[PDB]
Design a protein around this nucleic acid. Sequence first.
RNA 1: CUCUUAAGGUAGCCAAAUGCCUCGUCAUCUAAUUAGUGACGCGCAUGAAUGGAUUAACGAGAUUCCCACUGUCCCUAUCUA
RNA 2: GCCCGUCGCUAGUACCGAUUGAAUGGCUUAGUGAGGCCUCAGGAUCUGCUUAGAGAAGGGGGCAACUCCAUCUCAGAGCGGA
RNA 3: GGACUUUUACUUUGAAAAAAUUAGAGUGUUCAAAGCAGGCGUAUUGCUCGAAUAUAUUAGCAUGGAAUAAUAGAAUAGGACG
RNA 4: UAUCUGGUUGAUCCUGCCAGUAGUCAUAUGCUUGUCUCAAAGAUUAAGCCAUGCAUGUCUAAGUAUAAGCAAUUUAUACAGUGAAACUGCGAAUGGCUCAUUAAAUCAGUUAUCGUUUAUUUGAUAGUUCCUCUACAUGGUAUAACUGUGGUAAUUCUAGAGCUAAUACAUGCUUAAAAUCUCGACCCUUUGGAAGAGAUGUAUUUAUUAGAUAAAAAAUCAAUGUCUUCGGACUCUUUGAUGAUUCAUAAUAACUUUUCGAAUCGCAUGGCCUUGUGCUGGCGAUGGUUCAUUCAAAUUUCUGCCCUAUCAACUUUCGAUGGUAGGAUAGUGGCCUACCAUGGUUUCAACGGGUAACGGGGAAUAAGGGUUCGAUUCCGGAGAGGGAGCCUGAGAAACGGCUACCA
Lengths: 159, 260, 188, 146, 131
Amino acid sequence: GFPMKQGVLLPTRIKLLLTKNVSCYRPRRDGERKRKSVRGAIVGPDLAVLALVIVKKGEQELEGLTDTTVPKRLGPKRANNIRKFFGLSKEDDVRDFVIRREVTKGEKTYTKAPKIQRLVTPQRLQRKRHQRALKVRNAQAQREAAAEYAQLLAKRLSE
Amino acid sequence: ARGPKKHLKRLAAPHHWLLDKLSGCYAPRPSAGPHKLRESLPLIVFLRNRLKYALNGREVKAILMQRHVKVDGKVRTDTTYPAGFMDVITLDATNENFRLVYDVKGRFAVHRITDEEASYKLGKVKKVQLGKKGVPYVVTHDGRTIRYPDPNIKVNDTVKIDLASGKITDFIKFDAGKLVYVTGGRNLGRIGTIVHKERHDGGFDLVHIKDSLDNTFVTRLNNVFVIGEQGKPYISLPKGKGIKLSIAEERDRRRAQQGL
Amino acid sequence: GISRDSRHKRSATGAKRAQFRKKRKFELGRQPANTKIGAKRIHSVRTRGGNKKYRALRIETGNFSWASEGISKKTRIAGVVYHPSNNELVRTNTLTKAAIVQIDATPFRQWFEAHYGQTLGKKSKNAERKWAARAASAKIESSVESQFSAGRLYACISSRPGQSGRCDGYILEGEELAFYLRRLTAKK
Amino acid sequence: STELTVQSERAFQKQPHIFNNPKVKTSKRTKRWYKNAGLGFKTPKTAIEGSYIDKKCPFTGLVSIRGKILTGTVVSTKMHRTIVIRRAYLHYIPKYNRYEKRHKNVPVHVSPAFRVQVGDIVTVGQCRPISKTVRFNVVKVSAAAA
Amino acid sequence: PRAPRTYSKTYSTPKRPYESSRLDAELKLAGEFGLKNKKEIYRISFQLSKIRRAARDLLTRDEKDPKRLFEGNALIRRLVRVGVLSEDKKKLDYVLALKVEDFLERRLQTQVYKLGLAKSVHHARVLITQR
RNA sequence: CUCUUAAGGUAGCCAAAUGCCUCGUCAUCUAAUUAGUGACGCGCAUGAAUGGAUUAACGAGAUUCCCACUGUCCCUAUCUA
RNA sequence: GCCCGUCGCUAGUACCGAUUGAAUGGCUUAGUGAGGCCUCAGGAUCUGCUUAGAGAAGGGGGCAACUCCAUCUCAGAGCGGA
RNA sequence: GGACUUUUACUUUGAAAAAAUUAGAGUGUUCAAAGCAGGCGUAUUGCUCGAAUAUAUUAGCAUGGAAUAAUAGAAUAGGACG
RNA sequence: UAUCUGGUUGAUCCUGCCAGUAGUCAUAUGCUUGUCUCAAAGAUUAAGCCAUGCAUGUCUAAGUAUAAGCAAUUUAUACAGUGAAACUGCGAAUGGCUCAUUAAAUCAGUUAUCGUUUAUUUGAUAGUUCCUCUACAUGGUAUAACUGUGGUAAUUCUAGAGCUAAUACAUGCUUAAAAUCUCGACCCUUUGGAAGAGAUGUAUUUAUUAGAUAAAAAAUCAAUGUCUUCGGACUCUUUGAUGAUUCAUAAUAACUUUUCGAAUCGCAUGGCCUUGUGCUGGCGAUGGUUCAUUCAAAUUUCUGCCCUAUCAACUUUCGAUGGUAGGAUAGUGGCCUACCAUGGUUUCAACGGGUAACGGGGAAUAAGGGUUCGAUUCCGGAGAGGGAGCCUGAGAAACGGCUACCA
Ligand SMILES: [Mg+2]
Ligand SMILES: [Mg+2]
Ligand SMILES: [Mg+2]
Ligand SMILES: [Mg+2]
Ligand SMILES: [Mg+2]
Ligand SMILES: [Mg+2]
Ligand SMILES: [Mg+2]
Ligand SMILES: [Mg+2]
Ligand SMILES: [Mg+2]
Ligand SMILES: [Mg+2]
Ligand SMILES: [Mg+2]
Ligand SMILES: [Mg+2]
Ligand SMILES: [Mg+2]
Ligand SMILES: [Mg+2]
Ligand SMILES: [Mg+2]
Ligand SMILES: [Mg+2]
Ligand SMILES: [Mg+2]
Ligand SMILES: [Mg+2]
Ligand SMILES: [Mg+2]
Ligand SMILES: [Mg+2]
Ligand SMILES: [Mg+2]
Ligand SMILES: [Mg+2]
Ligand SMILES: [Mg+2]
Ligand SMILES: [Mg+2]
Ligand SMILES: [Mg+2]
Ligand SMILES: [Mg+2]
Ligand SMILES: [Mg+2]
Ligand SMILES: [Mg+2]
Ligand SMILES: [Mg+2]
Ligand SMILES: [Mg+2]
Ligand SMILES: [Mg+2]
Ligand SMILES: [Mg+2]
Ligand SMILES: [Mg+2]
Ligand SMILES: [Mg+2]
Ligand SMILES: [Mg+2]
Ligand SMILES: [Mg+2]
Ligand SMILES: [Mg+2]
Ligand SMILES: [Mg+2]
Ligand SMILES: [Mg+2]
Ligand SMILES: [Mg+2]
Ligand SMILES: [Mg+2]
Ligand SMILES: [Mg+2]
Ligand SMILES: [Mg+2]
Ligand SMILES: [Mg+2]
Ligand SMILES: [Mg+2]
Ligand SMILES: [Mg+2]
Ligand SMILES: [Mg+2]
């Protein structure tokens, strides 16, 4: 049952201390490394299965593999990720371009689509707008309060 | 002990809250806030123990989740919020403005105030210091830090804050003859003019206090809260004007008042 | 690991102390940085409550200060030349605070010979306008001038590399330079 | 026991960040930062017109004096730049309604500013751990017996 | 980790277990007040001892002493409101010489006897413990 | 109390280089001990300068065991003159 | 009359005692030394930057001439990262 | 007018102090152990007292006192005051 | 709540013990046991071993939904209700248990931080980011869940292939006026003077400087600052806190695998005139750097622990006491190292031993003074079979976390 491990070398099983973001191990709580077994990267006769990936195709179709073709499941969902997917321009507006997929209830059929994100919206630009002004207003209001006091300070000597 | 404690055993709580012994194992334990946890008064004790508006603990939240209570003009929603000295607490949907201010015994008393006065607060400056970029700042006991203050305001002086805009508006110095609350100690609850600040370089200065009855008593400087001019307090005072009565004197007053 | 607890120490009376509790991270110590001289290489170390110290393992180029001229320039750092704690720090050229080091002189030459006009011990009006005024304060210590002949400068490390990650320091002057100078002739 | 020729240590000895420009000819050969220890302790002339360093001195040094301020008689002047105080006291055993003489030994650092011999009553002030056992600094010295 | 629901015990037993003197006196109090057992005499005999001590102590203070006054009058005041201390033995000196029956007299049981109702302190009992 | 023959083995010590029976009994060491040691003692036939008992140091003296070491052995092989 | 000691029986107690007696725990000599951690290396695998050539763009503004920024694709020459 | 014990012990009075427990005031848990509640009235939208006080004999801090008991100082004057 | 009595003699009076008597938040046990209230309880011996179940998870209107979920209907052709799963965030360092270790340790009252760290709550705080032709109507790749091809007796194991998100990961724009400083094209020689070129947020690191003061008047050398009545003149001149600081705070010259300065979300749908999906704009949320606060933590001053001398000298093994410098730390410190000295504790009991020893609040016993107890309802400490090690995080030397040895 034990899986090979990219780049151990060796044709046997060895126990490793495994950490986050490493194959053959999914940490159950942030910080948990776990000393678990792993099989060598070198192909020996002890194998149950061997995962191969086709790089170059040969002279004959393989009935179940080369011939048939299976579809991705989800399309782009971010803004520009749709734009890179359809070779569009910044000015093109996604929205009327996103992959939809039909839903068949039993008598009523409807559809559904993502929710493009990073999407530029009326609302978003209103937010940058508010922040900006917030910054300038307070800056000026600060510079009045500073100036006011620096006057109150002068009078704490003149008088 | 590996980190901050989160519970409080109902027994290790401040006595002045006056919670009973049996009920459950626990007392609320003040959240982190503007007041020291032993010098504070959770909104939940207020609403349910002192006010009797709540029964359950559930009902306290149910109340607070209705944004029904402002502390110093800001709606407060945390059951264990640590309100404290000079705090205001405004119960809007019933026309009530209070101000946590001490008994004579030592317990945070129900002192209602005008729909005015809930406009402001007295705040004892704790430190006054040069902040970065040369800008000065004071710090009141209630965790307020108002920048750009009057250069005459030194430490132990009190200060009139607005509320709805922060901002200091007039202030009182600390010298001989000023009207003073006693914020903690054995004399917790008393009021009265100063007389003498016994200073001791190194540690703990002593402030001899006389009241509107000529009883003298001393506490520490960290315990004195200046609240006005002799016979002129900048906040309305609870019944009995923080006087202290000998239990003899105390006995007489009850039974005589009693009857008719 | 290491622990900076005073528990394990004998008492002043001399008494052995029984083990009270186990080690706690909030009293630990870490292994030293014996910062060397080479291509920049600093490892950061996650201290208590967030925070970063910076284990500098290899250092060339640290920011140095000529105190009397009022400036600071970033030299090379040649090697270490002395060290009051342990001479092994010299032998193996390890960089620490209070190190004593030879550093390049050319950035300091380049400043002197354009702030003053003079060369070191051998146009334009507004250029010469200043020069003549900045003069009469252009004679420095002879113990500091002659050094420039070798294109290297005796300097002392006032940073803490294995912490700061920076090997800053100042060029030895005055009576300070006299003293270390003295130690150098009697061994080096 | 004895006080050095100043620069008698493998590292140069100086107060920190107390610069004297060689570019500037002066009177005094070396700048000398000292201070007011506090509490009505008068920094002596020895602290000021002396050439000693001692980073752990309550004047001319980087150490504050706060907390207790104790007095004991001097009992051991053998350590370099630190001495041993004896503090005699009386413990009250309730049961016999009587007292017993106990004593304590307080290691305390003594600036070169004071020439302290054994027998001297000495006033010292608590001052942050200097070293393993030392938490006090000789801050005043009343006379011997002659 | 709750809070200790406190308690104390109400009686005390005699040091010498077989004083036929005391044993005689006790029984008289048992049939002349219709008592159940000795503990009913013990209880009060304890009760009484704590009073006389409290008194005893205050009597060692100065008169006009803040403490003596508040809690000397207090003692007397309680002992009056009950029927133990008579309308003018209202001093601390008299609370000392206060005897036992002085208490036992004021029992519901003895009182139910003391105004018709029962004709017998034993009748009085079985009447009270029966609503 | 008595008999031979003058006395009748005290202090000690022991299956001891003195004990037949005897490879004594008990304990200990060991898988197992006709061995060793510690004890026991009606001791064929221990014993007081015919010296008894004790004893540190010493011994190419007799004896038992432990650690080390090892071709003594298992189990023999190879080399040099 | 009282009464001392050897000697004799029974039972209990502690003491001495060959067993280089035994067991448990603390601290330890010397030799050996896991592990995670820090460091000199290692580099399965991935990868940011620069650069000459080629194809397809669009103009920083022209009667022919002139010239940026962004993206994406195949021999390479570099110095870097995980 | 503030600061003021040569250097102490002693003693007074306070301060900073935890609750529960203890002592102890109030209160009819039906009594009591307890509890810290409760009480008054038009009880058809109310009013209202409480939840005190004492105790800590070490040491530390602040303070009034200076009897008792220790302690320092002018004798080659190397004394004191200005 | 200040008491005694029985037992040595023929009798006597004493010494003196034994015996009685009374209580016990004092456990066991025997017998007995109807009602009300109150309700301790596997501490003692074994911190001995543990079947099995449970004891820590978490979603707002407000970070991520294309479920080949569910309801639906929305006005919904980007999304829009509800919502498994999963990513993100936070929590799991609290509680609860137990008393083994521990005798100057812990702990108690009392100090210190001018010796440090501090998620969070509360209050403050950011016009400066590029560059001598830049996306800011918004940059870039990757992954989970999911689909599908799989392995193994077995587990909260997971492989290789294919998809797609963000407040996950990685990037990166922006904003007024002035002022001050260096470099200085050039002109015109005197009192000489300058155009415009750059630099100037914060945080980091080093150096230097200011951070004044008890009360007054002159002379100079050096580099230059105002003015006027062009001779020479200058006044009303500026600075906080502490008992005490190289304090707060500021300035100069630079330093940096350059910290941060919103590419986030929910409700609102208003208002200007050139009418473009232009310009502006409200109530909150979630973040963010610094400082204060708060809940804490870490060290820490002074005094205080039972039996013991059939423990009298102990400590410097291989740090014991101290000096200097560094390294390490959140930080002081022989905490560690290097060098240097020979110091430190003790009959006022050191050192060592014992303890059927966690410290205290407290409990029992009542003339008093004392005697004895305190595993255990509250505070503090410690530990999770024994030890050591470490990850993650603000916080752990964590054990319902991991790694190793031992059992
Ligand atoms: Mg978004
Ligand atoms: Mg809370
Ligand atoms: Mg422990
Ligand atoms: Mg006393
Ligand atoms: Mg014959
Ligand atoms: Mg004989
Ligand atoms: Mg004889
Ligand atoms: Mg024999
Ligand atoms: Mg033989
Ligand atoms: Mg034998
Ligand atoms: Mg043999
Ligand atoms: Mg003979
Ligand atoms: Mg003979
Ligand atoms: Mg021999
Ligand atoms: Mg051989
Ligand atoms: Mg052979
Ligand atoms: Mg038997
Ligand atoms: Mg009515
Ligand atoms: Mg006094
Ligand atoms: Mg007789
Ligand atoms: Mg007895
Ligand atoms: Mg238990
Ligand atoms: Mg047990
Ligand atoms: Mg806990
Ligand atoms: Mg990508
Ligand atoms: Mg990439
Ligand atoms: Mg990637
Ligand atoms: Mg994949
Ligand atoms: Mg000042
Ligand atoms: Mg500073
Ligand atoms: Mg103690
Ligand atoms: Mg013994
Ligand atoms: Mg340190
Ligand atoms: Mg040192
Ligand atoms: Mg020595
Ligand atoms: Mg013993
Ligand atoms: Mg124990
Ligand atoms: Mg105990
Ligand atoms: Mg206990
Ligand atoms: Mg005890
Ligand atoms: Mg136990
Ligand atoms: Mg623990
Ligand atoms: Mg167990
Ligand atoms: Mg966490
Ligand atoms: Mg653990
Ligand atoms: Mg468990
Ligand atoms: Mg746990």
